[PDB]
Design a protein around this ligand. Structure first.
Ligand SMILES: CC(=O)N[C@H]1[C@H]([C@H](O)[C@H](O)CO)O[C@@](O[C@H]2[C@@H](O)[C@@H](CO)O[C@@H](O[C@H]3[C@H](O)[C@@H](O)[C@H](O)O[C@@H]3CO)[C@@H]2O)(C(=O)O)C[C@@H]1O
Ligand SMILES: [Ca+2]
Length: 195
């Protein structure tokens, strides 16, 4: 030991055909919604943050928060952004978060921002901007805790400093009631490491 993994895996299976059935909590407001969809012969969960917030949350236990802090963690998302912004797939711990905010800019490019930084980074232009990609957030602890962001396995930004936050969920989706955001999710993992 010791390691742990928490996931949503998009599936047609009845027993597990929403995130609610994989231990995640629906956390929409207003007009926000979601539904199982099927795209490339493959299930995806379509998050529809149109006129309301639309996201899913997962609760770590007391020891899991603490283990996450000692040994570090990795959050991987496989998604495709369809429209808008505040696509917020992230982890908060009662005290801090590394928040990447993903979107499509007014030129149609897939950009990423991080809370604590200012500016956007172009991840994909053209028809690439609105296809599936694999996004990794990798948190390395120490007395100098920083994060690294990866896009189909390519270091994009490192030395991302955590920022204060009272929230304490693993979250994915459109974490915003006013910024509309739409994306499809095949996979979410949050893995707590060993040493
Ligand atoms: C990623 C994340 O942390 N998302 C939060 C968001 C964002 O921080 C926010 O959208 C900024 O873009 O806020 C969410 O909560 C807000 C939401 O419940 C709205 C209701 O529309 O209320 C906000 O508080 C209000 C408060 O009611 C007012 O009295 C006061 O003026 O301050 C706020 C006005 O904006 C909540 O903060 C959200 O749902 O968008 C929660 C996300 O998790
Ligand atoms: Ca435990």
């Amino acid at each position: 030991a010791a390691m742990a993994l928490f996931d949503y895996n998009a599936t047609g299976d009845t027993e597990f055909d929403s995130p609610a059935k994989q231990g995640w909590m629906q956390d929409n407001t207003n007009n926000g919604s979601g539904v199982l969809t099927n795209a490339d012969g493959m299930p995806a969960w379509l998050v529809q943050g149109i006129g309301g917030r639309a996201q899913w949350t997962y609760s770590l236990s007391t020891n899991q928060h603490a283990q996450a802090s000692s040994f570090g963690w990795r959050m991987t998302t496989e998604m495709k952004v369809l429209s808008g912004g505040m696509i917020t797939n992230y982890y908060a711990n009662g005290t801090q978060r590394v928040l990447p905010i993903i979107s499509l800019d007014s030129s149609g490019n897939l950009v990423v921002e991080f809370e604590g930084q200012t500016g956007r980074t172009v991840l994909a232009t053209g028809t690439a901007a609105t296809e599936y990609h694999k996004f990794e957030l990798v948190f390395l602890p120490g007395s100098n805790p920083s994060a690294s962001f990866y896009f189909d396995g390519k270091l994009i930004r490192d030395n991302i400093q955590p920022t204060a936050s009272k929230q304490n969920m693993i979250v994915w989706g459109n974490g915003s009631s006013n910024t509309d955001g739409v994306a499809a999710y095949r996979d979410i993992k949050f893995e707590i490491q060993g040493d």
